[PDB]
Amino acid sequence: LGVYLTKKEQKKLRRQTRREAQKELQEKVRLGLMPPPEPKVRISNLMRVLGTEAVQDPTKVEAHVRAQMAKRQKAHEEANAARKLTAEQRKVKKIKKLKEDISQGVHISVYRVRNLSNPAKKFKIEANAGQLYLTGVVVLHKDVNVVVVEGGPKAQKKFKRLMLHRIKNKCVLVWEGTAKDRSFGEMKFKQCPTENMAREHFKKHGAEHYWDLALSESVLESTD
RNA sequence: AAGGUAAGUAU
RNA sequence: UUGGAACGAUACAGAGAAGAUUAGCAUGGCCCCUGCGCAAGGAUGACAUUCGUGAAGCGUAUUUU
Numbered sequence: 604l605g606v607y608l609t610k611k612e613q614k615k616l617r618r619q620t621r622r623e624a625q626k627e628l629q630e631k632v633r634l635g636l637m638p639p640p641e642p643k644v645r646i647s648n649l650m651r652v653l654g655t656e657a658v659q660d661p662t663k664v665e666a667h668v669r670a671q672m673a674k675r676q677k678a679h680e681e682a683n684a685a686r687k688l689t690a691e692q693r694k695v696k697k698i699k700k701l702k703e704d705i706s707q708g709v710h711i712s713v714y715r716v717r718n719l720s721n722p723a724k725k726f727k728i729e730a731n732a733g734q735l736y737l738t739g740v741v742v743l744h745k746d747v748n749v750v751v752v753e754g755g756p757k758a759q760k761k762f763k764r765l766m767l768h769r770i771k772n773k774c775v776l777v778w779e780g781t782a783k784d785r786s787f788g789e790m791k792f793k794q795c796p797t798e799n800m801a802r803e804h805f806k807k808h809g810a811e812h813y814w815d816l817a818l819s820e821s822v823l824e825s826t827d
Numbered sequence: 828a829a830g831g832u833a834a835g836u837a838u
Numbered sequence: 839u840u841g842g843a844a845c846g847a848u849a850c851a852g853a854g855a856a857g858a859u860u861a862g863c864a865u866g867g868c869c870c871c872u873g874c875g876c877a878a879g880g881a882u883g884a885c886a887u888u889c890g891u892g893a894a895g896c897g898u899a900u901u902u903u
Contacts, residue, residue, distance in 0.1 A: 618866095625865070642863040652862060683874035690875080726885040734884095769882080 643675070644668050702736055703755025708781045709738075710759040712752050715817045718772035719748035725792065731765055732790040740787045742801045742814070743794040749801070749817045751810065753785055777816050786810055 608616065631637045644652045649668050657664035690698060719725065725741070728750065732739060737754030752762050759779075766774055786808040795801035798818060805814045 621866095640864070644863085648863085654862095679873075683872095686875045687873085693875095723885065727883095729886095730884060 641671075644671055646672075701757075703757040705755040705758075708783075709753045709785055710756050710781050711739075711778070712759050712763060712776055713778040713813050713816070714748075714750045714752075714766055714774050715777050715820055716748035716750065716772070716774045717746055719743065724770055727770065728766070729790050729792075731762060735761055737762060737790075738785055738787055739790060741790075741792055742804065743792070744796065744798065744801055747817055747821060749813060751787060751813055753782065753787060775820070777820055778813065 628637070628640075632639050642648075642652045646668065649657060649664065653664045653668065728741070731737075732752060732754075735754065735758040737752050737758040739750070739752035739754070741751075742749045750766070752759065754762075763776065763779075767776070787810070793801075793804065795804065798814070802811055802814045805811045
């Protein structure tokens with residue numbers, strides 16, 4: 604795997620690179636490749652470098668100094684913008700499209716909410732599933748909201764904190780594990796007033812145990 | 828008797 | 839013509855002063871600040887116009903002395 608050079612080692616590497624570039628510039632100036640560097644003049648520096656010529660033509664000297672200052676700013680601004688161009692393409696397509704490397708295992712979290720009659724919470728859950736690229740489904744029934752979400756580990760860790768802490772009748776994760784491949788499609792909604800219609804839909808993808816676990820948890824909560 | 832030598836080029 | 843002297847004589851010069859002098863910028867060190875890139879990571883916001891007939895249900899001859 605990769606190795607991490609220490610802080611002193613980073614300082615040494617940076618110092619050596621800077622000295623190499625400085626020597627490159629110095630030898631270029633020695634051999635006449637580049638013109639010799641001009642003094643860097645700011646407004647407070649104007650009376651020290653251009654002092655004798657700023658009494659004869661003060662405004663020409665001021666204009667020359669400010670042109671040099673702008674050109675120094677022109678290079679820096681252009682450089683930052685030039686590198687910024689990388690994000691232009693490497694942004695929502697290369698700085699926000701990760702997918703958490705979900706290829707060998709899909710973390711699946713099944714939550715059983717008691718009251719999910721608010722459409723705002725379902726819309727926020729659908730937006731969190733579509734933004735984090737986490738597949739799954741949500742089955743509604745009489746005091747039973749079975750929300751299964753299969754995705755990456757980071758998306759599952761985000762959805763475990765969004766549903767239990769960022770969204771408010773209680774929500775409890777009934778099964779948190781991994782699977783071989785994916786079973787559910789995109790994030791859709793389906794209402795089933797009968798338990799058999801939800802169990803037949805959960806058995807179409809081979810996940811009939813999620814409804815039987817949610818029925819058993821409700822039976823164990825209503826028994827005690 | 829001293830501690831009081833300018834040095835330097837040029838023949 | 840040919841010898842003394844040559845540590846001398848004369849000619850020139852004589853500041854026998856005191857010195858690595860001094861201005862500019864950049865680099866380098868340090869602490870911020872600003873912008874961009876790189877590698878990750880936090881927290882959080884967002885939804886889908888008039889009237890009659892025929893039939894059914896309801897109603898406070900005890901409570902406006």
